[PDB]
Sequence to fold (72 residues):
Amino acid sequence: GPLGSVQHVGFKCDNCGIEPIQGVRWHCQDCPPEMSLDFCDSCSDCLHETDIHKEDHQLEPIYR
Amino acid sequence: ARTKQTAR
Ligand SMILES: [Zn+2]
Ligand SMILES: [Zn+2]
Fold:
């Protein structure tokens, strides 16, 4: 069943560039919907920043 | 990154 198995077809990571994140998605809470940034179960701890993406925020874990 | 496709 769920947890550690979640498939997010349509959400490739920004940290490592992996296709459609597996296990749990990490939806950026403060970065805008136009960007809609994402991290893997490991990458969500990486605390990354771009031109828009910053460490000023938090991420949301998605178990489904 | 939202690669998620949708209708026009
Ligand atoms: Zn990743
Ligand atoms: Zn972000």
Residues A 13, 15-16, 18, 39-40, 43 surround zinc ion (ligand 1) (CB under 6 Å). DSSP finds no helices and no strands in chain B.
